[PDB]
Amino acid sequence: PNITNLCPFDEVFNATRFASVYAWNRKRISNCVADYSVLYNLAPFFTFKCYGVSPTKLNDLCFTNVYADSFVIRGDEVRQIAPGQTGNIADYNYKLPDDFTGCVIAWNSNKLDSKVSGNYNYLYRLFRKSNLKPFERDISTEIYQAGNKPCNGVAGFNCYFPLRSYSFRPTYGVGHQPYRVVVLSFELLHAPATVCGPKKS
Amino acid sequence: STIEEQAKTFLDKFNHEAEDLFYQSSLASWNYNTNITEENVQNMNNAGDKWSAFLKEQSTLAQMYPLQEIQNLTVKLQLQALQQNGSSVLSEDKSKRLNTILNTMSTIYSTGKVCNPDNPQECLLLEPGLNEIMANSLDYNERLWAWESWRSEVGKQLRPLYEEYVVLKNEMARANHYEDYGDYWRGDYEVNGVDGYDYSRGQLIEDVEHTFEEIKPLYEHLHAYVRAKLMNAYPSYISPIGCLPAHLLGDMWGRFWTNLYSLTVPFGQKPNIDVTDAMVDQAWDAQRIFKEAEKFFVSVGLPNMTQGFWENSMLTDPGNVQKAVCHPTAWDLGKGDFRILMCTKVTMDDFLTAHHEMGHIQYDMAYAAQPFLLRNGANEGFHEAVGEIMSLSAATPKHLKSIGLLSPDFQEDNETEINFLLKQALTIVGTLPFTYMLEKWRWMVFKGEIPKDQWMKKWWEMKREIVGVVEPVPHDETYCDPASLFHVSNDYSFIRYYTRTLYQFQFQEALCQAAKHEGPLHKCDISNSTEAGQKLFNMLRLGKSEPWTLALENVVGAKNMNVRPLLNYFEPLFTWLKDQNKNSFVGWSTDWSPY
Ligand SMILES: *[C@@H]1O[C@H](CO)[C@@H](O)[C@H](O)[C@H]1NC(C)=O
Ligand SMILES: *[C@@H]1O[C@H](CO)[C@@H](O)[C@H](O)[C@H]1NC(C)=O
Ligand SMILES: *[C@@H]1O[C@H](CO)[C@@H](O)[C@H](O)[C@H]1NC(C)=O
Ligand SMILES: *[C@@H]1O[C@H](CO)[C@@H](O)[C@H](O)[C@H]1NC(C)=O
Ligand SMILES: *[C@@H]1O[C@H](CO)[C@@H](O)[C@H](O)[C@H]1NC(C)=O
Ligand SMILES: *[C@@H]1O[C@H](CO)[C@@H](O)[C@H](O)[C@H]1NC(C)=O
Ligand SMILES: *[C@@H]1O[C@H](CO)[C@@H](O)[C@H](O)[C@H]1NC(C)=O
């Protein structure tokens, strides 16, 4: 039948400001029609690495809920947004499960997220006592104790503030330019699946 | 929980803060160097200050981790690089006096003006005029006046400065658990803790001696030939049995002999391989010169240039309104930013220099995956050696016929090969005894082997004994004749040029046997050979993480300096010099028979 009520992917992808990778934004997508053909047909979105589902059959497979996790990382850490990868982002900032059903989308945003002085609004967690669970968000600013003496909240010797800033500048290489990443996770529940693509006449 | 994990976490936080602060410092130095304006000067000063203060406080926090309980070699190497006191180990008054001495040596060398008596209405500086009168003039007494006047004035104003400088640097090195400042400079080649690849600070001098002992016959023949040709230039002043007069070496100090190609040409009737006319006829602009160098580097298999390299590098002199430093420099700003500061003219020399600086940039690009404090050459020779091998391969007639600068009907006979090899020998073999002599004098004066009142007598004797160059007149200790050179006056290690010269031809033989070259070594090109590029990139990717002995074993399959590639490079020139030194006397006498 005649289709309306598109899913708000414009509020996720074409947002003015994305969150940091340590405080990654999660937007749930429900009760709308989800046209993935828009995301495929845009040429600036360079990386469309989809795992556990084919990008061609996204328009036919219907799911219960769609999770759009949005954050900003560097160029070299785009590859860490993948199942089974390791590094600072995968261990401490954003962890993907190995049985991950969903696609990742990443694109360069040097024109938006970089300033000549340097952009300091984007932060990543450098030190955690334990590696993160999949889809876990850690927003704590508690002092990291690398030594034996208690830190007592003061970042002195062997006590570091766990969050470091990505100082994005428009003159950095491709591996250090800011990359905006949106991760779509598709889940199916016993509830009636209401996020589906359109049907042809 | 252990000390090593504390060191790893500390190094991670240091690496992040270091790369941001270093980037700001390098961007401000770049903005000063491409745009000489006083706000750029104060921006560079503020960023340099915040960088030096950052490393001061991070070395203070880094010396709380002892090294004897750290077993990982990379963490140990990063902490050894970070924990170096430098000049901070002294008292504040002595450190301030040392920086004052270094600054006033810099201002004396930069603003040293020496001119003719009885004509004081203007006078002539070293870099514009004295270099030209030393390299271009053919008059004996004019070169003698310039040489003696500059050394007399600069020596009398610099001798007590060097007198205090040697004592302050000796105290700095002995406070830093080194034997002397020469041991501190030899500590760059020190490798400790790796089995089989261990290299001591003390071993380098006999290694240099062991290489120079096989350098010495070839240099003697070259010296004899140069002496014969200077006999053609100066009829009565030079003796057949004696050394060369010092002010006839084409430079101010005798460091390079490349200004004698006009006087010492083997075959002047044969043309040179200068391709400047081909560039200007075909309108080769600087952008496409760097594009051709990039084509060479993707022919050998190395990655091409970044987009920010083409956007941000200033490859052309900007104009009269904006002043910039014209010195060719390759910049690794950090955060994947690589630039070349070069005011390119349309010449073959700037083409070869562009290949050299892009070799520098490729070396900087390859170790970008390394941690920040390991982002350097494995020793100080490797960084210039990997650029000079590109300058070697791009200068071959085969490569110039490949890229269209040289005609396919060009005849490469043996005479132009002999004169090309003699130009390369005056550039390369000529600087080796001067470099080894200067460093060995500096090593003994830091060691205290040379007494304080015996400096000039020892130095001139070694110049007679090693380099085979005699002074015009005797000089007493009111003079400081070493200190007239840029590197010794501004606290620079000088053995890097000797080691770079050896590593250059070692890398050239390793790449040319990798690329299956079937001729002599000086004809060889590494273009269109992916395996030679992979063999080289195995060393370029290491950076400072591995010992330089291990990096050398990765390239040439040897862990120590070898002089056999350099003499194998100059083998037909060696046979030619043996042929034409039959009538002349090879070798020199230490007597003052020329003057
Ligand atoms: C964002 O803006 C671009 C601009 O052309 C548009 O093509 C696209 O449909 C918009 N929405 C999304 C979700 O990308
Ligand atoms: C160089 O500095 C001057 C100083 O005012 C400035 O006007 C000019 O724009 C600078 N050049 C560049 C290329 O930024
Ligand atoms: C040393 O530490 C680095 C990371 O800091 C690690 O990759 C490497 O495997 C370690 N080497 C050894 C021998 O433990
Ligand atoms: C650096 O100097 C300080 C102050 O004397 C000293 O405690 C420290 O051991 C020195 N470090 C090294 C590596 O010599
Ligand atoms: C470098 O080479 C790659 C492929 O070899 C190409 O995609 C890229 O555009 C090149 N970049 C430049 C600046 O030539
Ligand atoms: C070049 O080769 C020819 C042919 O053997 C020989 O006659 C001539 O002497 C050689 N010239 C030089 C400078 O070696
Ligand atoms: C290297 O390859 C390029 C392209 O295949 C070719 O134009 C060039 O002539 C080759 N170089 C040599 C020395 O043959």
Numbering used by the authors:
A (entry chain A): 330 to 530
B (entry chain D): 19 to 613
The study reports:
SARS-CoV-2 relies on a trimeric spike protein for host cell entry via recognition of the angiotensin-converting enzyme 2 (ACE2) receptor. The spike protein comprises two domains: the S1 domain, which contains the receptor binding domain (RBD), and the S2 domain, which is responsible for membrane fusion. The RBD mediates attachment to human cells through the ACE2 receptor and is the primary target of neutralizing antibodies. The Omicron variant has 37 mutations in the spike protein relative to the initial Wuhan-Hu-1 strain, with 15 of them present in the RBD.
Focused refinement of the RBD-ACE2 region resulted in a density map with a resolution of 2.66 Å at the spike protein–ACE2 interface, allowing the visualization of side chains involved in the interface. (B) Cryo-EM map of the Omicron spike protein RBD in complex with ACE2 at 2.66-Å resolution after focused refinement. In the Omicron variant, three mutations are observed in this stretch: Q493R (Gln493→Arg), G496S (Gly496→Ser), and Q498R. Residue R493 replaces the hydrogen bond to ACE2 residue E35 with a new salt bridge, whereas residue R498 forms a new salt bridge with ACE2 residue D38 while maintaining a hydrogen bond interaction with ACE2 residue Q42. RBD residue S496 adds a new interaction at the interface by forming a hydrogen bond with ACE2 residue K353. Additionally, the mutated residue Y501 in the Omicron RBD makes π-stacking interactions with Y41 in ACE2, as previously seen in the Alpha (B.1.1.7), Beta (B.1.351), and Gamma (P.1) variants, whereas mutated residue H505 (H, His) is not hydrogen-bonded to E37 in ACE2, in contrast to what we reported previously for the Y505 residue. Compared with the Delta variant, new interactions are formed as a result of the mutations Q493R, G496S, and Q498R (D) and local structural changes owing to the N501Y and Y505H (Tyr505→His) mutations (E) present in the Omicron variant. In isolation, the K417N mutant displays reduced ACE2 binding affinity, but our findings suggest that the new mutations in the Omicron interface have a compensatory effect on the strength of ACE2 binding, providing an explanation for the similar ACE2 binding affinities that are observed. Cryo–electron microscopy (cryo-EM) structural analysis of the Omicron variant spike protein in complex with human angiotensin-converting enzyme 2 (ACE2) reveals new salt bridges and hydrogen bonds formed by mutated residues arginine-493, serine-496, and arginine-498 in the receptor binding domain with ACE2.
